[PDB]
């Protein structure tokens, strides 16, 4: 009577949350879209957060071996990394440290040795940045948002999404809010007037969103027509075709454009100070 044979397995193992790795794995898996599409292959990801000591580490790998699984991992303490590869070797199981390469490149380039301490440990912790606390007020602003008090928000908002219902306004607005931006959504509906404040605010920062209907319900054709006229009336608004694109993709388009305008450069790019 058990829960864990079926498919090729992958262990994601971190002394912290496991998310950085899960992200990298998620992206990596993209290279086998077509494999996974038709179940040509199939994968199981198993995520082990908070692996901050030796005993617990050794058990995971033991298990990984028992299950027959690749171990992708992230461990701040160098000894733990050594141990992981040694114990992977000893149990005869494939492995790979997904971000020491990245940690070390940064370490030489900055010219400082890594602390070797995870986020988990008692030292330096509770040290949440100003970047983080900004993203909270963004998140707050963006969800705490009725259409009753829209005008005022359009002035405050860093980004303004404008588009018909079936564009991804809510997820996207939330995604951008997490990145640090106060976002305001303005739906385009046949037969309701847009707030005049939409056009009085800074017109850089309004972004049109649109669906390609090519992917009865030709009312949607009607709406998309009406929408494009609004967008014509407003040439300076970028108009992003949104269907079959991930939020995170669209978000990058918007942010590239936003940052390119917000700071005019030789080479256009999204920049952050640390």
Ligand X SMILES: Nc1ncnc2c1ncn2[C@@H]1O[C@H](COP(=O)(O)O)[C@@H](O)[C@H]1O
Binding residues (CB under 6 A) for ligand X: these are 14-20, 27, 30-31, 33, 74-76, 117-119
Decide if 188 contacts 194 (C-beta within 8 A): yes
Q: Which of 244, 162, 248 is nearest to 207 (CA)?
A: 162
**105 labelled binding-site residue:** no
Place of tokens 């005049």: 196
Site for a second copy in 28-57 (CB under 8 A): 28-37, 40-50
Round to whole Å and give the CA distance between 128 and 116: 19
**25 labelled binding-site residue:** yes
Beta bridge partners of 159: 183
- The residue range among 113-121, 152-160, 198-206, 232-240 that interacts with a second copy, by the rule CB under 8 A, is 113-121
**What's the min distance (Å) between Cβ of 160 and ligand X?**
25
**228 labelled binding-site residue:** no
Round to whole Å and give the CA distance between 5 and 22: 21
Nearer to a second copy, 42 or 189 (CB): 42
Interface residue with a second copy among 27, 149, 192, 217 (CB under 8 A) is 27
**123 labelled binding-site residue:** no
Does residue 121 come out as left (phi exceeding 0), alpha (psi in the -120 to 50 range) or beta? beta
**What's the min distance (Å) between Cβ of 230 and a second copy?**
25
| Binding partner of residue 190 among ligand X, Mg ion, a second copy, none, CB cut-off 5 to 8 Å per kind | none
Decide if 57 contacts 80 (C-beta within 8 A): yes
Question: What CA–CA distances, in Å, run from 236 to 102, 105, 153, 204?
Answer: 39, 41, 20, 7
Instruction: Classify residue 117 by its DSSP letter.
Output: -
Q: Which residues bind Mg ion (CB under 5 A)?
A: 14, 18, 20-21, 74
**24 labelled binding-site residue:** yes
| Binding partner of residue 41 among ligand X, Mg ion, a second copy, none, CB cut-off 5 to 8 Å per kind | a second copy
| Binding partner of residue 54 among ligand X, a second copy, Mg ion, none, CB cut-off 5 to 8 Å per kind | none
């Amino acid at each position: 009577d058990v829960c864990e044979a079926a498919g090729k397995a992958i262990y994601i193992v971190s002394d912290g949350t496991g998310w950085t790795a899960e992200h990298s794995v998620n992206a990596a898996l993209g290279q086998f879209e077509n494999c996974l599409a038709d179940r040509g292959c199939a994968v199981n990801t198993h995520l082990f957060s908070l692996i901050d000591d030796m005993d617990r580490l050794i058990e995971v790998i033991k298990q990984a071996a028992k299950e027959g699984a690749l171990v992708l991992y992230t461990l701040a303490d160098p000894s733990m990394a050594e141990a992981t590869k040694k114990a992977c070797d000893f149990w005869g199981v494939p492995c790979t440290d997904v971000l020491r390469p990245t940690v070390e490149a940064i370490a030489s380039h900055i010219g400082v040795a890594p602390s070797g301490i995870p986020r988990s440990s008692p030292s330096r912790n509770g040290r949440l940045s100003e970047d983080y606390f900004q993203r909270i007020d963004a998140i707050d602003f963006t969800i705490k948002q009725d259409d009753g008090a829209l005008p005022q928000n359009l002035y405050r908002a860093d980004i303004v999404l404008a588009g018909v219902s079936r564009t991804g306004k809510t997820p996207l607005s939330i995604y951008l809010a997490q990145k640090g931006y106060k976002v305001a959504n303005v739906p385009i509906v046949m037969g309701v007037d847009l707030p005049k404040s939409l056009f009085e605010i800074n017109q850089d920062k309004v972004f049109g969103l649109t669906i390609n209907p090519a992917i009865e319900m030709d009312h949607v054709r009607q709406e998309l027509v009406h929408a494009n006229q609004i967008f014509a009336q407003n040439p300076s608004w970028p108009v992003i075709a949104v269907t079959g694109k991930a939020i995170e993709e669209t978000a990058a388009v918007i942010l590239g454009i936003l940052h390119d305008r917000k700071q005019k450069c030789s080479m256009p790019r999204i920049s952050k100070r640390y």
